[PDB]
Structure 1
Amino acid sequence: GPEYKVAILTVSDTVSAGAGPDRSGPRAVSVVDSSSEKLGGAKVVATAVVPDEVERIKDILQKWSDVDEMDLILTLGGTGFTPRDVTPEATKKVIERETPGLLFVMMQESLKITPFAMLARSAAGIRGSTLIINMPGNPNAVAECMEALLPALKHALKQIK
């Protein structure tokens, strides 16, 4: 397997219910894959979809960190202002050490693209030796957020080990 095991969690009532396809997930996988060397040897080894439900999100983040030994978990979606956007709240429950600089850079860079970046309520942090980062559900958002992080993400992953 890879130096760094990456897992992608799509958070969406719509996708989970079979009411639409996942358009964000494949874009996240593509951005990680195409940056695999810049990330120190990272590969997406697993993806999943969960509804906008705090307990479901928490359970998968805990399993991936504590049991499956993932190194990086990117979540996609559920970061906005609607009542069903609960990804950050689930994430804050599971992380042990917050990583606000990652959120700073994602916001700073995203705002250059659209003022609507300010509506992302993303959280990020470390649980054990797993880095967890919330990204927006807009399929174009993951690429933009990953570009923002890529300069330092390899060093983040080295450090957490």
Structure 2
Amino acid sequence: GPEYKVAILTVSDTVSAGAGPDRSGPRAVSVVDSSSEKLGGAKVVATAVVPDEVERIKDILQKWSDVDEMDLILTLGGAGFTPRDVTPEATKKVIERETPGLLFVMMQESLKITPFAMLSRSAAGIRGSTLIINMPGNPNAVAECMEALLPALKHALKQIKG
């Protein structure tokens, strides 16, 4: 069906333990769905929630990439200065080829909105033919980051296939 399969992974001890709801996952889904056309026809086919533990985060990025063959994986949360925030360190263990331009743009554009954006420690890269991008836990943030990436994201997914 979908030209590009997208999966969104929410990282949060609080959500994962049933102690709270996921306010970022829906919005993330909603932004991808709303931009399907500019993304060359992409659709979120899976979401999941892990806690702030690297091995849990690694296993999913691995599975989604190697086995389910997702084309785009966004992570939400676990990428700030909190002691538990380990999303980037797990992300960095699984990508094969880094994509610093995407990080640069996310940081450049979100700084225009607030200096607290410098607290984002996001990683991004390519494993196999999957693009993986770390994004922040705030709901407003995915929208801000996806607006920033949108001009090039379709061309990026196109190039990873060839």
The TM-score, its normalising length taken from structure 2, stands at: 0.99
Distance 2:73 2:8 in 1: 6
Once the 2 structures are TM-superposed, how far is the Cα of residue 139 of structure 1 from its aligned partner? 1.0
Paired residue secondary structure (1:140): helix
In the alignment of these two chains, the number of paired residues is: 161
Distance 1:56 1:160 in 2: 26
Paired residue secondary structure (2:139): coil
Distance 2:136 2:50 in 1: 15
Distance 1:70 1:42 in 2: 11
Once the 2 structures are TM-superposed, how far is the Cα of residue 149 of structure 1 from its aligned partner? 0.1
Paired residue secondary structure (1:88): helix
Computed over aligned residues only, the root mean square deviation of the Cα atoms, in angstroms, reads 0.4
Distance 2:94 2:146 in 1: 22
The TM-score, its normalising length taken from structure 1, stands at: 0.99
Once the 2 structures are TM-superposed, how far is the Cα of residue 115 of structure 1 from its aligned partner? 0.7
- Counterpart residue number, 1:124: 124
- Cα shift readout 1:91-128 (whole Å, capped 9, x = no counterpart): 00000000000000000000011111000000000000
Once the 2 structures are TM-superposed, how far is the Cα of residue 133 of structure 1 from its aligned partner? 0.1
- Cα shift readout 1:25-79 (whole Å, capped 9, x = no counterpart): 0000000000000000100000000000000000000000000010000000000
Distance 1:102 1:134 in 2: 10
Distance 1:62 1:159 in 2: 21
- Cα shift readout 1:119-145 (whole Å, capped 9, x = no counterpart): 000000000000000000011100000
Runs of 4+ in 1 over 2 A off after TM superposition: none
Percent pairwise identity: 99
- Extract unaligned runs of 5+ from structure 2: none
